[PDB]
Amino acid sequence: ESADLRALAKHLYDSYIKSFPLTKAKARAILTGDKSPFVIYDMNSLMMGEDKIKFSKEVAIRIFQGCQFRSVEAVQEITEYAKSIPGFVNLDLNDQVTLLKYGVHEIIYTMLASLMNKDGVLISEGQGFMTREFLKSLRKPFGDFMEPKFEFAVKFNALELDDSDLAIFIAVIILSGDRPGLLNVKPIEDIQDNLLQALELQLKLNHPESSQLFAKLLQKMTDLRQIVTEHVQLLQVIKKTETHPLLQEIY
Amino acid sequence: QLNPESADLRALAKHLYDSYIKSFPLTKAKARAILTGKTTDKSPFVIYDMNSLMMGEDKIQEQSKEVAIRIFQGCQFRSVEAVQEITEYAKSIPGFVNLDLNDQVTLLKYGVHEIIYTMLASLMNKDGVLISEGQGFMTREFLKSLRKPFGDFMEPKFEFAVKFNALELDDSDLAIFIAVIILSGDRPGLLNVKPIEDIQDNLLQALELQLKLNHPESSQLFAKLLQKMTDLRQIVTEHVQLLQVIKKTETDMSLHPLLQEIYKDL
């Protein structure tokens, strides 16, 4: 038993590395110490960032839209990772679609915590770092955008999880048999149970000193959903401003 | 091999179950007994409509107004007593009274409703809910048909209850779970979070051990229980966002102050 669990864990860790360009081991190195990224902290710090950073309206509207693009991009990565989760591509296609539809938002904020610290967040592959203070200073309602997520990251990162821990954790979120619309819950839940097992063992072997880390992590799914519904409400409010057709479509 | 560490956990579990029974009149076992027929002397008077409601009053505000509202006032008062019960239970939690007093308040302020709906599930089944200490049973349809802004206060509850009840938790599981809920460090305002987490940690140790010993054949029941914690939060939020409406549609309807303080700033 412990066998198959280790296997499943290494499997997910590796798939996680293949599907996600910027791991947490890297985001953390960057945030601390080596090719220092371009700190964006000022309006004029931003303009210089537009050029020094690379592979319409005001400015706050351009940053939020910038997050949109990254989101859609990330969604594909998450989708490719998901297919790696043993048993996933065997489920009914409608359910795979459903699980992804309701699971990506929770996964984006989970991984976003990987690129955040109490003072800011890494943007564009980690080339930059827009400070928390600056983001907060964006004219309403855009200065309530990242503040909530920052409070989440502080708490989530306090668990000190690593890529091998998150790899499994992300899978659990995807295999959530509670998504509205599912046609066949049995298989999904069965997989989640098995994933919950792998994550439990992964935590007691990796963080033997962390008492009940497993329990504290599960408790965070609450925070995630708070974040997600709150973010969805922001989108409603916003959906009232400067009102390409193909772009709006892509989102 | 019973270990001395797991010996304390077991002890912690017996302790909490005891205060749970001592603090709450209507346990799940009794509620269960009443609902499933281990009755002849325990059967409730069922309310599934207006005349039935009229007739139920006898054995089961300070005057009268409207149904939907008389029922609402009903629940309001009932929860004032539950808060009192939970507060009584809280104090029994090893370490809860030692905490800062401000945090004591914080914990209860947010914890009271997650626990009420957790326990309210014990008195429900897909078809309705027990009331008046179990002497009565109000059907899901009667409630869901109440006047516009009210015929929607309960539906989400049943929704969660049939799902939650599916885990098949019994009173000795719930006492520990309820303690976990109260001792949650991630509550707004908490001055001292560390002490609150060392306690909750222990409780979770108790619960994980309790569930494995009590439901050996139920795979990952622990984790499945914890996930439910998010359903409660939404139940609460969804709820709060319903009082506000009552607070606008029904201006002549008062609210017990206590409840007005718990809901305040949430």
Residue numbers in the entry:
A (entry chain B): 207 to 239, 243 to 264, 274 to 461, 466 to 473
B (entry chain A): 203 to 262, 271 to 476
Please give the exact wording used by the authors of the publication that reports this structure.
The PPARα and PPARγ LBDs were complexed with the same pan agonist, TIPP-703, which activates all three PPARs and their crystal structures were determined. The two LBD–ligand complex structures revealed how the pan agonist is adapted to the similar, but significantly different, ligand-binding pockets of the PPARs. TIPP-703 (pan agonist), (S)-2-{3-[(4-adamantan-1-ylbenzoylamino)methyl]-4-propoxybenzyl}butyric acid, has a prominent adamantyl group at the para position of the tail benzene ring and a propoxy group on the central benzene ring. To obtain the high-quality crystal structure of the PPARγ LBD–TIPP-703 complex, a three-week soaking of the ligand into the crystal was required. Even in the best structures determined at 2.4 Å resolution, the propoxy group located at the centre of TIPP-703 in the PPARγ LBD complex was disordered. However, we did not observe any significant electron density corresponding to the propoxy group of TIPP-703, although the ligand molecule was mostly ordered in the crystal with an average B factor of 65.8 Å2. This indicates that the propoxy group interacts weakly with PPARγ in the ligand-binding pocket. On the other hand, the two protomers in the asymmetric unit of the PPARγ LBD–TIPP-703 complex exhibited slightly different conformations at the C-terminus, leading to the loss of several protein–ligand contacts. The overall binding modes of the pan agonist are similar between the two PPARs, but significant differences are observed in the protein–ligand interaction. In the PPARα LBD–TIPP-703 complex, the adamantyl group mainly contacts hydrophobic residues from the H2′ helix (Ile241, Leu247, Ala250 and Val255) and from the β3 strand (Val332 and Ala333) at the entrance of the ligand-binding pocket. In contrast, in the PPARγ LBD complex the same group mainly interacts with Arg280 and Ile281 on the H3 helix.
Peroxisome proliferator-activated receptors (PPARs) belong to the nuclear hormone receptor family, which is defined as transcriptional factors that are activated by the binding of ligands to their ligand-binding domains (LBDs). The members of one subgroup, the peroxisome proliferator-activated receptors (PPARα, PPARγ and PPARβ/δ), are the key transcriptional regulators in fatty-acid and glucose metabolism. PPARs are activated by metabolites, such as fatty acids, and synthetic ligands and they regulate gene expression by binding to specific DNA response elements located in the enhancer regions of target genes. All of the PPAR LBDs fold into a three-layered sandwich comprising mainly α-helices, as also observed in the nuclear receptor LBDs.
